[PDB]
Structures are given as C-alpha cells and as structure tokens.
C-alpha cells in the first residue's frame, strides 16, 4: 500500500532505498499461478465467475527458488503490492534494500543472464496498465545499468513500440534526472471520482480496489503524515530538503 502510493520517481526510488528485501518476499504459501479457476462474484452473478491466476494479483503465490523468481517477486511487489514465497534466501540478502539489490554489485546476486522478454511475459505485461508498465520499465532500467546491459535495454524497447512511448527518461547514476522527471507512477491515491465499496469481477481489479479503499482509510487515519500541520515534529534526518539525494547517485 505504501509502495503503490508513490507518485514520482523521487518518492518511489527513495522508498525502495529505505525498505529492505524482506518486504518484497512473503511467507504465506499461497497458490500457484497460470491456473484457470472459478471464483465467486455474487454481487453480479449467481454462477462462478471464471478467471486466471497470475503473478500480478495482490495475493501471495508460490515462486521459483532462483534469481529469476527473486526479480519477479521484486517487480511484483512494486507493481502489485505483494510478493511471492521464496524462503531460505539468507539473512545477508534479506537485510539489504530493494534498490541495492537492483543496482549494486556488492550484494553478490548475479542477474546478467536475465532476459527481459520472458520476465515481461511471465509478469503478464498484456494485462498491466500504464502505471504498472512504467514501474516495470524502471526496474528493467535499473537492472540493465547494474550489469552494463544498456544496449540490450534499448534494443528491447525498440522492438516494442508502446513500451518505448511510455518508458521513463532517467539515468540510474544521475540524481538530476530523477528530480526533473514528471511521470505519474501512482496506482493508489485520493480519487477525484466517486469510489464506492463494491466488488469487481477480475482478481486483479478486486485486489487493486481493496488497496485503493485501504489507502483512503490509511490517508484519514492517524498514521498519515500531514506536512502542513506537523512539519516541525519530523526529525531532521527525514525532513524534506532539496539538497537530499540518493546514496551513491
């Protein structure tokens, strides 16, 4: 819910630096993806509504115990709000931040062999929306510059024209690019339209709506930080300053 509320490249990247990798993984076994299922949607129909389980739903699913599965779980957390079930990774990797896993060689993970075609295919990209695609392209760009595969990233974008049109423009090593970027990456927020407490047919839409109504409850709760009222109560380390920049950028 917190990750899905980030609306800018600065806020999203700042959140990924603070959060550790254990948030990306989940310890609930869940079910398996790519399975045709019959779910119950009684507000609309009496029969059982068919659908297909995927990795993009907000429910935890069993994942493969490899580097490919780890990256899919990280991107799933960013674009959906929940990750997968990959246990016994190791406390050394789980303490490090999501950004460090994505763009630092010191962690020890090897991601050079990863192919963006199957990752996009597995993390079903024909079913994503514009905001979800932009976040995935951010993760691909961060990984590509980590292993020096910028040329491969460009060729992949040139093959898929719609991805190129919405691809965010920022250099992973430069902080000026993050500041200048004005893409909207928010999947949840205060809605201008009328948001009701009703169900949606698809698994993806129902889970997304639950996060949206959950954010409204959290926005009006006591855990939210109203800057206009209590800006002098935050500590100096976490106060918003223009001089602030990501570590190593």
């Amino acid at each position: 819910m917190d990750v899905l509320s980030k609306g800018s490249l600065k806020e999203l990247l700042a959140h990924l630096e603070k959060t550790p990798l254990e948030e990306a993984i989940s310890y609930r076994i869940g079910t398996v993806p790519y399975q045709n299922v019959l779910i119950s949607r009684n507000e609309y129909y009496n029969q059982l509504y068919p659908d297909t389980t995927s990795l993009i739903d907000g429910v935890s699913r069993e994942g493969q115990r490899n580097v490919n599965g780890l990256i899919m779980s990280i991107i799933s957390y960013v674009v959906s709000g929940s990750g997968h079930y990959i246990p016994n990774i190791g406390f050394m990797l789980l303490r490090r931040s999501i950004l460090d896993i994505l763009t630092k060689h010191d962690t020890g993970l090897v991601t050079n062999n990863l192919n963006y075609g199957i990752i996009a295919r597995n993390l079903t990209v024909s079913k994503m929306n514009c905001e979800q695609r932009k976040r995935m392209l951010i993760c691909f760009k961060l990984l590509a510059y980590k292993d020096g595969n910028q040329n491969d990233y460009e060729i992949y974008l040139n093959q898929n024209i719609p991805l190129k049109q919405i691809a965010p423009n920022f250099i992973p090593g430069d902080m000026r690019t993050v500041i200048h970027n004005q893409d909207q990456l928010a999947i949840v927020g205060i809605p201008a339209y009328r948001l009701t407490q009703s169900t949606e047919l698809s698994i993806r839409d129902d889970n997304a709506k639950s996060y949206k109504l959950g954010y409204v409850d959290w926005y009006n709760s006591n855990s939210f930080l109203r800057e206009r009222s209590e800006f002098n109560l935050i500590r100096l380390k976490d106060r918003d300053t223009k001089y602030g920049k990501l570590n190593g950028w």
Binding site: P20, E22, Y27, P87, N88, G90, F91, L94, R95
Partner: protein, 298 residues
Amino acid sequence: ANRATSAFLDNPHPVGVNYVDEGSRQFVAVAELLASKLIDSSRESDESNSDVPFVQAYSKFADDNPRHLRVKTGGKMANALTNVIRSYYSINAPAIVPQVEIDRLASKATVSGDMYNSYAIFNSVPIVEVLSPARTTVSIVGSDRADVTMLNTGAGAANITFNFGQIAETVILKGSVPFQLARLNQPMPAARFTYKLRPLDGPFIVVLPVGNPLVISATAATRIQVPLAFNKALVESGFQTAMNDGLFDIQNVNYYSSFDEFIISQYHAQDGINRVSTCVILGLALQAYDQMRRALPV
C-alpha cells in the same frame, strides 16, 4: 575382518544455517531470560496469593495482557521461538520468521548473545570403529555407557582395534574381567580392570583370549563451549518436548534419543565446528521452550 560403529554416529543430517547472526542469537537469549522469569513469577504469585507478579511477567513476554477464556499461548514470542527451533534442526526446514520480528523481540531485554562464555561436559561415547579379525564377533550397545561384547571363536588370541575419534578428551574403559590394552606398537602391560586413555593418542589394541566373552564398558567426556545460561537438565527436557510436539517432523532427518547424542554426532562430522555452534544455539532455544511451555501448557 569386520567393523562396527556406534548407532548414533551414522549419517548426521545437515543443520539449519538461518538465525545464527548476532541479532538472532540475542533473540534466543532474550527468550531464555524472559521464559525463566515466567516460571519464577508463577511460583511467587502462587505463594503470595496475588496474581500481579504473573501478569507483569506474561505481559513483558507476550506483549498482551493475560485474560481468562483465552488459551494463553505466549503471543508472538511463542510463534517466533517455535519456528526458529524448527529451522535449526534441518536445512530444508523453511525459515518463516521476519528479521523485523527478531529485532523487535530482541529489544525487550539487554543481553549479550555471546555463546562462548562457558563450557559444558557431554557424556556420549564416540566409538567410531572397532576392527575385529575373522571368527570374532563384536557388538556395540549404548550411547551414554557403551558395552562392547567380544567373543573369540578362533584358536588363537586375536587383536581388536578401537578407534574413539579425535574429539573426546577422556575415555575410561572398564572390563568384566581384566584385559590387556596398549597403543599401536607398544608393549602390552599386565591385565587390569580399568584404563584411562586420550583419544588423540591413537588406535588402541585389545587382546582377546579364547573362552568366555569379554564385555568392555566405555565412559567418555567431551567439553563444548556454551553460554553461561546453559543448563543441561533443562535442555534435555526441552529436547524431549520438542520431539513430542512435532517440531522435528521434517522429512529426511535423523532422530536421536538425547541432546547429548545429537550434539556429539554433529561434532563427529564434516564441518563439525560450524555445526556445533548452531547446535548450541538450538540448545539454548530448547531450554527457553521448556520453561515457557511448562509455564503455559497448550
């Protein structure tokens, strides 16, 4: 020629490699300290006709107030303590405790997770192998006190080779009848009833006269570094409780009658020093589990 070995020294399964860091070791120590206070508070509350000492102890341990009509499991600490025990036993047991939960629980008390402050003596006897020539039968029974029964059917006196490993410090051998024992390439002394040997000295040769069977009773002592709070009596009871409770039901693992046999068997295995460090942490975890479960049965 025939060889025989102790039953409990065969095929030690790999132990878990999670929750062995500094913060995780502090969590087990915190659980041990707080589980002990739960036991003492129960005795004090019962003897002082007031339940207020128990409420404070349980609230600190479980992070919620004790209420009637509730099972009184122990809160998040009981769940975390139970799961870390399962991960310690086997390397295929999933580690499903978040690092945030470990740090949050470890901050309840100010303890040092140093697991090398003190030592403990373990009495399991590691008979690695006994080599016997033809027409001689050798049988090994027991782990706390090993009884080796040897019979010499052949015409001449035979030589039985004893190998006690290189980990144990002292092995005391007593026989039903006086017998002759000496190291390799050494004069055989007069027959005596008892022998004290250092396992690092080398393979030992025992002469076996033809006739009535000879039974040798072996008692060993080994020293392993343990934290100061370690208590062998509490660990043994907790080990039995965990096996009964089903914490060790993971597939493809070995089962042992006691923690003494478990810790020694892992020591007599490849990367024994690293294994023993994990087994010691499991021991302190099992001691906290025994105190807590006795205070709060489910």
